[PDB]
Amino acid sequence: GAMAPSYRVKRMDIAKNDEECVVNAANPRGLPGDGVCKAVYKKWPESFKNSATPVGTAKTVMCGTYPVIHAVGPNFSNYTESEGDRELAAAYREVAKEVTRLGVNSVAIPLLSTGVYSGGKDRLTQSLNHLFTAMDSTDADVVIYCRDKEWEKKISEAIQMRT
Numbered sequence: 001g002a003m004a005p006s007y008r009v010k011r012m013d014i015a016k017n018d019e020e021c022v023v024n025a026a027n028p029r030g031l032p033g034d035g036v037c038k039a040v041y042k043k044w045p046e047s048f049k050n051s052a053t054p055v056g057t058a059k060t061v062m063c064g065t066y067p068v069i070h071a072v073g074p075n076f077s078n079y080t081e082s083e084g085d086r087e088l089a090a091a092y093r094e095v096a097k098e099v100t101r102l103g104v105n106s107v108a109i110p111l112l113s114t115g116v117y118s119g120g121k122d123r124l125t126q127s128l129n130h131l132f133t134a135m136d137s138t139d140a141d142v143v144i145y146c147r148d149k150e151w152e153k154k155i156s157e158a159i160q161m162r163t
């Protein structure tokens with residue numbers, strides 16, 4: 001575990017993380033995909049061997065000794081708000097199980113279902129709160145990755161609101 005387990009946020013490409021493992025915002029079929037998933041495919045293509053897994057689940061595949069945790073959030077274009085919310089919470093609980101099993105001291109994680117799976121809605125608070133519910137009981141250093149300056153500010157404020 002980390003000496004003093006913490007949450008941090010960085011505004012940069014998750015493919016350049018400084019953590020002991022990465023969470024992919026994967027699609028269920030293990031395709032190269034878009035956004036975070038395409039950046040992960042470019043950096044760790046070997047990790048896409050038999051990475052297909054259902055919505056609400058996480059499947060880890062090693063690239064060398066570096067673990068890629070493929071976490072499949074729901075596409076809110078297809079799911080109801082209610083069922084989508086349940087599957088999004090479930091995907092993060094499966095990420096916490098994998099991070100724990102791997103014994104890593106740190107993990108790089110994107111906000112699941114906030115990109116092309118958001119159904120055109122702002123889901124920062126919804127996704128981040130489900131991340132906290134899952135990861136609060138783990139002792140890895142969690143580093144959340146985002147793209148946009150306004151998202152970095154709101155994620156940072158939410159982290160500080162608890163400390």
Ligand SMILES: Cc1cn[nH]c1-c1ccncc1
Pocket residue numbers: 012013014015035036039110111115145146147
């Ligand atoms: C599209 C991309 C590539 N590397 N990281 C991202 C990213 C990460 C977090 N939030 C939005 C985008």
Ligand SMILES: [Cl-]
Pocket residue numbers: 011012013016
């Ligand atoms: Cl970057």
Ligand SMILES: [Cl-]
Pocket residue numbers: 025112113114115116117118
């Ligand atoms: Cl997404």
